[PDB]
Each structure stands twice: as C-alpha cells, then as structure tokens.
C-alpha cells in the first residue's frame, strides 16, 4: 500500500520477486533546492542556428 | 568575503564564485558559534546580521 | 503511520514512551467555523501612534 505523503513529495518503491514480501521504497521531495538532478548534461547549441 | 543566510530557510552559502541555495521545511536557524583561528596578522572579523 | 486524511484538514500525535506500542492522534479540522480558536487574546493597540 502507498503511504500518505506529502503534497509536493513522490513516491516510488521496487524490489518484489523474491519469493518473501519485502520490498523497497522511496519519497523523493523536490523542495525548492534550485539544483536540478538529472542525466545527460547537456552538450552545446549549434552556432549560427 | 563570503557568508552565509538563513532567512525564512532560505539556506544561501555564498561563495564569490558561487552560491548554494537550498530550503528546508523542519528547518530553522537561531543560534551562531563563531569560532577564530589562534592567531591573525591583522584583526579578524566575524558579523552576525 | 499517518492516515489519509481530507484535504484542509490536520494532524497530530503524541505519547509514546511508555514501553508498549500504543499512543494518541488527533485530527483537527479547520472547516470554516469563523471562531478562530487561539492563546493570548489581544490586549490593547495603545492609542495615539
């Protein structure tokens, strides 16, 4: 069951499949930090386009 | 010069290179320990706004 | 666990530390009664500023 959580936070979990009823969980919160947290930094714009 | 802010947990940590900025929500901030080198050439100096 | 709860509404919980698992929550509601409900009730604006 997914628990309550905050109205801004998100959840994800995994890690079924192994023949016992644990599990893993996560809560991400994306509070206002200004860095984003992603892949593929991104390279260069194309001059002159 | 550098310092640091916390007003309503916006948490800043400048730098004259960079900032870094973060809010924290079960975040707050009241108390300043200021410690000093054992000795300096010249006055060192600390400020608490 | 916090329960699901609706979505103006608050909540709150206390006591444990008793060596058993047992303990108290509360849920306050907020729905419009336009009685606020406070400590301190005002004392005076002096007069003349």
Redesign the interface.
């Given at each position: 069951v997914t628990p309550y959580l905050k109205p801004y936070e998100c959840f994800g979990w995994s890690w079924n499949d192994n023949q016992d009823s644990i599990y893993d969980w996560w809560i991400a919160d994306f509070?206002?930090?200004?860095?984003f947290v992603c892949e593929s930094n991104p390279e260069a714009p194309k001059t002159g386009v | 010069m550098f310092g640091v802010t916390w007003y309503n947990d916006l948490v800043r940590i400048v730098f004259p290179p960079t900032v870094?900025?973060?809010?924290?929500?079960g975040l707050q901030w009241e108390r300043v320990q200021f410690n000093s080198p054992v000795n300096a050439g010249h006055a060192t100096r600390f400020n608490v706004v």
């Open positions: 509070v206002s930090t200004g860095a | 870094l900025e973060m809010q924290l929500d």
